[PDB]
Amino acid sequence: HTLVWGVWVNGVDQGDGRNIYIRSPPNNNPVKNLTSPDMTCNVDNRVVPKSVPVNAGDTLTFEWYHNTRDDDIIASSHHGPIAVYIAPAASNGQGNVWVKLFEDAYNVTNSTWAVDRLITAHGQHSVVVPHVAPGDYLFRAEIIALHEADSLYSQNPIRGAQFYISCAQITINSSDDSTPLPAGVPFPGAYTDSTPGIQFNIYTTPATSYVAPPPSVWSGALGGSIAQVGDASLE
Ligand SMILES: O[C@@H]1[C@@H](O)[C@H](O[C@@H]2CO[C@@H](O[C@@H]3CO[C@@H](O[C@@H]4CO[C@@H](O[C@@H]5CO[C@@H](O)[C@H](O)[C@H]5O)[C@H](O)[C@H]4O)[C@H](O)[C@H]3O)[C@H](O)[C@H]2O)OC[C@H]1O
Ligand SMILES: *[C@@H]1O[C@H](CO)[C@@H](O)[C@H](O)[C@H]1NC(C)=O
Ligand SMILES: *[C@@H]1O[C@H](CO)[C@@H](O)[C@H](O)[C@H]1NC(C)=O
Ligand SMILES: [Cl-]
Numbered sequence: 001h002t003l004v005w006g007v008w009v010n011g012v013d014q015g016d017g018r019n020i021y022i023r024s025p026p027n028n029n030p031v032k033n034l035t036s037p038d039m040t041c042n043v044d045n046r047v048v049p050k051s052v053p054v055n056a057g058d059t060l061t062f063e064w065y066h067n068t069r070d071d072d073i074i075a076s077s078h079h080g081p082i083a084v085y086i087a088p089a090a091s092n093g094q095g096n097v098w099v100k101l102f103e104d105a106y107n108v109t110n111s112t113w114a115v116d117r118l119i120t121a122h123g124q125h126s127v128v129v130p131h132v133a134p135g136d137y138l139f140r141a142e143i144i145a146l147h148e149a150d151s152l153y154s155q156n157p158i159r160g161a162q163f164y165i166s167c168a169q170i171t172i173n174s175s176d177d178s179t180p181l182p183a184g185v186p187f188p189g190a191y192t193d194s195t196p197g198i199q200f201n202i203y204t205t206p207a208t209s210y211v212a213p214p215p216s217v218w219s220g221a222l223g224g225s226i227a228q229v230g231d232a233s234l235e
């Protein structure tokens, strides 16, 4: 159970974005139905009044929280991967439009899942803004908690993988458009019951065996990380 508070750009807090530049749902409940329109941008997908200005090569940091800002972030039991997708805003997230910019599942050296490191990072994870066409975009951050992913929601609606999905409105101003955005995948649609990484038993299968759900990260992506960039408590 987790939500996005706001974003930072180049290490500078953009301010509380809830219902402003984040298409925030009313609470931190997961989405579980892979076929639902809620998979796109969660349960209250509508245009919000602001879009955060960035330039290609900027560091965009999402900041998550549980109940209040800079708390325990997400329950420790919710082990699983983190991904970030991008789509043009004109799509409203519909169609074959979502391109993956970032994936982190399990780090063998550290023996930690992405969620574990998100907690340590005070909720913060980043992507570098790619050299796509200037314009308005949606950035879709997605945490998959796997604690009940041994079952499929479609079969047992009280269990299943849990998706914590947040869409930020981002305007890319300066970019050369040297890496124009390629074809993407649909949400809902890209994940099905048989997709690698949707049904998995974290308790009995080694975490090193885990494969996150495709698509693969786009070759034009410029990187990212799960790491604290700013101290919320100084404000
Ligand atoms: O040996 C292994 C077994 O142990 C393994 O069992 C699994 C263990 O984990 C089980 O899942 C737990 C389900 O309950 C979650 O706690 C809930 C989370 O939600 C809380 O409510 C929200 C809190 O946040 C507020 O903001 C929000 O308003 C609330 O709605 C609620 O209070 C908690 O009870 C635990 O985090 C999960 O760990 C799982 O079902 C078992 O299968 O099975 C495999 C076996 O090998
Ligand atoms: C899952 O979503 C689809 C598509 O909106 C819907 O038809 C179906 O009833 C949902 N399943 C549940 C259990 O609500
Ligand atoms: C691995 O753990 C060390 C200390 O435990 C930490 O400094 C480092 O950031 C971790 N790696 C990642 C990818 O966070
Ligand atoms: Cl603020």
Ligand SMILES: [Cl-]
Binding pocket: 030, 031, 032, 033, 036, 038
């Ligand atoms: Cl759902």
Ligand SMILES: [Cl-]
Binding pocket: 049, 050, 051, 052
């Ligand atoms: Cl604006």
Ligand SMILES: [Cl-]
Binding pocket: 067, 068, 069
């Ligand atoms: Cl708060």
Ligand SMILES: [Cl-]
Binding pocket: 001, 074, 075
């Ligand atoms: Cl919790």
Ligand SMILES: [Cl-]
Binding pocket: 120, 121, 122, 226, 227, 228
């Ligand atoms: Cl950190």
Ligand SMILES: [Cl-]
Binding pocket: none
């Ligand atoms: Cl739960």
Ligand SMILES: [Cl-]
Binding pocket: 056, 131, 174, 175, 176, 177
């Ligand atoms: Cl550029």
Ligand SMILES: [Cl-]
Binding pocket: 059, 126, 127, 128, 223, 224, 225
């Ligand atoms: Cl980064």
Ligand SMILES: [Cu+2]
Binding pocket: 001, 002, 075, 078
């Ligand atoms: Cu939860």
